[PDB]
A and B are shown apart, each in its own frame.
With several copies, the nearest count.
Chain A
Amino acid sequence: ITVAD
Chain B
Amino acid sequence: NSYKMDYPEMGLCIIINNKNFHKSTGMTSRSGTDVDAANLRETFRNLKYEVRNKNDLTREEIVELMRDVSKEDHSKRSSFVCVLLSHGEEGIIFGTNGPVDLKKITNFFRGDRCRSLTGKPKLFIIQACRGTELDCGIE
Contacts and interface: CB of A to CB of B under 8 A. Distances in A.
The reply, when asked whether chain A contacts chain B directly with Cβ atoms under 8 A, is: yes
Contacts of A3: 28, 30-32
Contacts of B128: 5
Contacts of A5: 30, 86-88, 127-129
Nearest to A2: B32
- Determine the main DSSP class of A at the interface with B: strand
Contacts, number: 12
7 contacts: A3-B28, A3-B30, A4-B129, A5-B86, A5-B87, A5-B128, A5-B129
Interface in B88-111: 88
Interface of A: 3-5
Given A3-B31, A5-B88, A5-B128, 9 more contacts: A3-B28, A3-B30, A3-B32, A4-B129, A5-B30, A5-B86, A5-B87, A5-B127, A5-B129
Contacts of A4: 129
Interface in B62-87: 86-87
Nearest to B88: A5
A5 to B, nearest CB: 4
